[PDB]
Amino acid sequence: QLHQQQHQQQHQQHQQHQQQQQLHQHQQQLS
Amino acid sequence: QLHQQQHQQQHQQHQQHQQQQQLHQHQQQLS
Amino acid sequence: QLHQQQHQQQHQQHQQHQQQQQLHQHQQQLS
Amino acid sequence: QLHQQQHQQQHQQHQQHQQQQQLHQHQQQLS
Amino acid sequence: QLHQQQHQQQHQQHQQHQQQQQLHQHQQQLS
Amino acid sequence: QLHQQQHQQQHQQHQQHQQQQQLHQHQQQLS
Amino acid sequence: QLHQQQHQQQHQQHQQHQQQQQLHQHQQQLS
Amino acid sequence: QLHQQQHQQQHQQHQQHQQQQQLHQHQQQLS
Amino acid sequence: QLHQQQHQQQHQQHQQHQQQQQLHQHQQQLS
């Protein structure tokens, strides 16, 4: 009995001039 | 009995001038 | 008894000038 | 008695092989 | 009595092989 | 009585092989 | 008696998910 | 009697998830 | 009697998750 949980959060609020910003999220799970 | 969960969230609010920004989300699961 | 769940959310609200922005979402599952 | 001026110039002369080049100009004014 | 001036110039001359070059100009004024 | 001036210049001459070069100019003024 | 040769090869085999990949080949010769 | 040769090879095999990868090849010869 | 040779090789095999990787090859020859 195996339980794998992955959670990622990115929050941005009240901003200006983020030209070419990168928000990358990667998640991998194996068995 | 295997349970794999992956959650990703990106939230952006009240913004201006994010030309060519990247919001990339990648998820992989294997068994 | 295998259970694989993947969830991805991108939310953008109240914005201006995001010319050529990329919101990409990728999900893969294997067994 | 407010006076706002914005000027932008891009000049290119006598060139070759600029495949997929970007000349972007952005201007914003508020009151 | 407020005077706001913004000037931007990009000049390129006698060139070769600038594939995928970026000439970006951004100007913002607020009052 | 306020006077705000911003000047930016980028000059390139007689060049070769600047693939994926970036010439970015940003200007902001507030009151 | 001038001899100029240029050869370029790109080989891809047995692949998956290369969205928006770029395979660019450039060749120039002068005399 | 001048002999100029340029060879470039890019090989990729058995791959997955190379979104927005760049395989660029540039060759220049002058006389 | 001048002989100029340039060889470049890039090999990748059995890989996963190389998003936005760059394989650039540049070659120049003059006389």
CSV table of N, CA, C and O in Angstrom, one decimal, chain E residues 3-25:
chain,number,residue,atom,x,y,z
E,3,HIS,N,5.9,67.8,-17.0
E,3,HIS,CA,6.4,67.5,-18.3
E,3,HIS,C,7.2,66.2,-18.2
E,3,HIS,O,8.2,66.1,-17.5
E,4,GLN,N,6.6,65.1,-18.8
E,4,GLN,CA,7.3,63.8,-18.9
E,4,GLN,C,7.6,63.4,-20.3
E,4,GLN,O,6.7,63.3,-21.2
E,5,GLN,N,8.9,63.3,-20.6
E,5,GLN,CA,9.3,62.8,-21.9
E,5,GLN,C,10.2,61.6,-21.8
E,5,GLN,O,11.1,61.5,-20.9
E,6,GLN,N,9.9,60.6,-22.7
E,6,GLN,CA,10.7,59.3,-22.8
E,6,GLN,C,11.1,59.1,-24.2
E,6,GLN,O,10.2,59.2,-25.1
E,7,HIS,N,12.4,58.9,-24.4
E,7,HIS,CA,12.9,58.6,-25.8
E,7,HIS,C,13.7,57.3,-25.7
E,7,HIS,O,14.6,57.2,-24.9
E,8,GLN,N,13.5,56.5,-26.7
E,8,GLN,CA,14.3,55.2,-26.9
E,8,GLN,C,14.6,55.0,-28.3
E,8,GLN,O,13.8,55.1,-29.2
E,9,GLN,N,15.9,54.8,-28.6
E,9,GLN,CA,16.3,54.5,-29.9
E,9,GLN,C,17.2,53.2,-30.0
E,9,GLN,O,18.1,53.0,-29.1
E,10,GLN,N,16.9,52.4,-31.0
E,10,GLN,CA,17.7,51.2,-31.3
E,10,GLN,C,18.1,51.3,-32.8
E,10,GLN,O,17.2,51.4,-33.7
E,11,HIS,N,19.4,51.3,-33.1
E,11,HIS,CA,19.9,51.4,-34.4
E,11,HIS,C,20.9,50.2,-34.7
E,11,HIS,O,21.8,50.0,-33.9
E,12,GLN,N,20.6,49.6,-35.8
E,12,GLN,CA,21.5,48.5,-36.2
E,12,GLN,C,21.8,48.6,-37.7
E,12,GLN,O,20.9,48.8,-38.5
E,13,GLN,N,23.1,48.5,-38.1
E,13,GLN,CA,23.5,48.8,-39.4
E,13,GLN,C,24.6,47.8,-39.8
E,13,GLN,O,25.5,47.5,-39.0
E,14,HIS,N,24.5,47.3,-41.0
E,14,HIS,CA,25.5,46.5,-41.7
E,14,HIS,C,25.8,45.2,-40.9
E,14,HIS,O,26.9,45.1,-40.2
E,15,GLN,N,24.8,44.3,-40.9
E,15,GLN,CA,24.9,43.1,-40.0
E,15,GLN,C,24.3,41.9,-40.8
E,15,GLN,O,23.6,42.0,-41.7
E,16,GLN,N,24.6,40.7,-40.2
E,16,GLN,CA,24.4,39.5,-40.8
E,16,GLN,C,24.3,38.4,-39.7
E,16,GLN,O,25.1,38.4,-38.8
E,17,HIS,N,23.3,37.5,-39.8
E,17,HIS,CA,23.1,36.4,-38.9
E,17,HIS,C,22.8,36.9,-37.4
E,17,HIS,O,23.6,36.7,-36.5
E,18,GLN,N,21.6,37.4,-37.3
E,18,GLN,CA,21.0,37.7,-36.0
E,18,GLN,C,19.7,37.0,-35.8
E,18,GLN,O,18.7,37.7,-35.4
E,19,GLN,N,19.7,35.8,-36.2
E,19,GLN,CA,18.5,35.0,-36.1
E,19,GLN,C,17.9,35.0,-34.7
E,19,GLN,O,18.7,35.0,-33.7
E,20,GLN,N,16.6,35.3,-34.6
E,20,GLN,CA,15.9,35.2,-33.3
E,20,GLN,C,16.4,36.3,-32.4
E,20,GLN,O,16.2,36.1,-31.1
E,21,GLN,N,16.9,37.4,-32.9
E,21,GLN,CA,17.3,38.5,-32.0
E,21,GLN,C,16.0,39.3,-31.6
E,21,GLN,O,15.0,39.2,-32.3
E,22,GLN,N,16.1,39.9,-30.4
E,22,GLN,CA,15.0,40.6,-29.9
E,22,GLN,C,15.4,42.1,-29.7
E,22,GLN,O,16.3,42.4,-28.9
E,23,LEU,N,14.6,43.0,-30.3
E,23,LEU,CA,14.7,44.4,-30.0
E,23,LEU,C,13.4,44.8,-29.4
E,23,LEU,O,12.3,44.8,-30.1
E,24,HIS,N,13.4,44.9,-28.1
E,24,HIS,CA,12.1,45.2,-27.3
E,24,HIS,C,12.3,46.6,-26.7
E,24,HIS,O,13.3,46.8,-26.0
E,25,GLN,N,11.3,47.4,-26.8
E,25,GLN,CA,11.3,48.7,-26.3
E,25,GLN,C,10.0,48.9,-25.5
E,25,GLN,O,8.9,48.7,-26.0
